Design a protein around this ligand. Structure first.
Ligand SMILES: Nc1nc2c([nH]c(=O)n2[C@H]2C[C@H](O)[C@@H](CO)O2)c(=O)[nH]1
Ligand SMILES: Nc1nc2c([nH]c(=O)n2[C@H]2C[C@H](O)[C@@H](CO)O2)c(=O)[nH]1
Ligand SMILES: *[C@@H]1O[C@H](CO)[C@@H](O)[C@H](O)[C@H]1NC(C)=O
Ligand SMILES: *[C@@H]1O[C@H](CO)[C@@H](O)[C@H](O)[C@H]1NC(C)=O
Ligand SMILES: *[C@@H]1O[C@H](CO)[C@@H](O)[C@H](O)[C@H]1NC(C)=O
Ligand SMILES: *[C@@H]1O[C@H](CO)[C@@H](O)[C@H](O)[C@H]1NC(C)=O
Lengths: 124, 124, 124, 124
């Protein structure tokens, strides 16, 4: 019965925050992503996110992915991971991400993608 | 003058094909992703995708990200890359992807993520 | 003044431990990587590693990469990261890794690579 | 019998070249990596590489990994992949890589790792 659900307010290991609304019945959802550019406490930015969670076998702990469309740069980041209910134990989203920068020349493509992780917990 | 445009029919280096529809003014779009099994010859699965293309500075070669919500498994894949005008004049999407599998215990999280690339060109 | 030094005994966020020996003047080094199975409790496998640490500008927090040649499978893992002095003063290696599995046909290449992270701290 | 062997001279999809010497009986090997920084035809640089190939079940087509210790930067890149003998069909190494940059502050770690691929063919 214990459905790990993406809807709500989350924060992460770098101190960025994220809010995701209601997941409709085809798994779609939208959110906002707020990020720490600086000392962390002054300059904030909001960017939209859009994703889908997988509904195959109505899992507790489904996998999901979403795209963050940076409002302050020409970059795009995509996240994928899984909503786990560890013991008790908050909910926790374990994610991996790819950050695509824009390059002017296709000869620079090879260097345009960063990778990393994010762990998200419910915001308090 | 012409730009690189996600809208249309695409194919890739693995033989999978993808159709993307119109890109609205927020950069959102929807589409379909077809791939195949065995000796790539008969059974074709279709899965929807949703993503966004970065609109910051209305670039001619925009970055973008999308999420593929697999119809036939518990998995999710995210793609991000850039729509280039190649040196030979043809549109190409250079992407990288993260394929997240569903695991059962959070202790298996470590091994749930594959990474790789796809290069898409227009279909005839 | 003290720098961050790969030489020594290390442990990580998954419970695996690693020993690295002396780093010669070319930046080369060797060591051992131990991990475990089931409920992480009894059977420990040991595999050798070899790598190099970047020496350009004799930095105090050098980047490095190493290859783990698994003793118990056909697989290979590579790690790369950086040896930091953390904010709390303790040495930490932040790494990312690519785990390549062996496949049989070149058509399965696409799915042979996992990615993720490990964070190492010194053992007592 | 057809052993895909790392020893030799290779080139890649970006026009970098690589030479690897003899693989000893524990799988170790060393090489040089020559890279195109510019128009491709003028400024060359050589950097050492060191790796191991997996010897578990003496495979044709073993997996391998290696570290390239950049001589002209504080970065490190690691490659992992597999030596395939496709039909006939050259030998071909399909690789993935992680490029670690040096960051001054551990607060920048998250952005320090790029990922991508390289396909290598025997040099002619
Ligand atoms: N992809 C990604 N981007 C991030 C994270 N945190 C963060 O601040 N960013 C911003 C940094 C960069 O300035 C911007 C696009 O260049 O994305 C983050 O965790 N992931
Ligand atoms: N990791 C990696 N690095 C490369 C490749 N090609 C290339 O020229 N480099 C260089 C570029 C960069 O200037 C240097 C270290 O910063 O590594 C490459 O294919 N992979
Ligand atoms: C996240 O939320 C809290 C306020 O509830 C705050 O510490 C911080 O400003 C937020 N982080 C960002 C990047 O805005
Ligand atoms: C992709 O489309 C082409 C039609 O141009 C078709 O020949 C091919 O089999 C398709 N591949 C898949 C997996 O749908
Ligand atoms: C790592 O080392 C510690 C000793 O400090 C031990 O308790 C632990 O079980 C070891 N883990 C493995 C997998 O070797
Ligand atoms: C690779 O080798 C050939 C010469 O055989 C040449 O085209 C090129 O200069 C080499 N590439 C680099 C980066 O040196």
């Amino acid at each position: 019965a214990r459905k790990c659900s993406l809807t709500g307010k989350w924060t992460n290991d770098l101190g960025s925050n994220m809010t995701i609304g209601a997941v409709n019945s085809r798994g779609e959802f939208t959110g906002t992503y707020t990020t720490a550019v600086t000392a962390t406490s002054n300059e904030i930015k909001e960017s939209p996110l859009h994703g889908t969670e997988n509904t195959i076998n109505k899992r507790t702990q489904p996998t999901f992915g979403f795209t963050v469309n940076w409002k302050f740069s020409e970059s795009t980041t995509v996240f994928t991971g899984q909503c786990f209910i560890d013991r008790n134990g908050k909910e926790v989203l374990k994610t991996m991400w790819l950050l695509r920068s824009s390059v002017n020349d296709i000869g620079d493509d090879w260097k345009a993608t960063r990778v990393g992780i994010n762990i998200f917990t419910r915001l308090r």
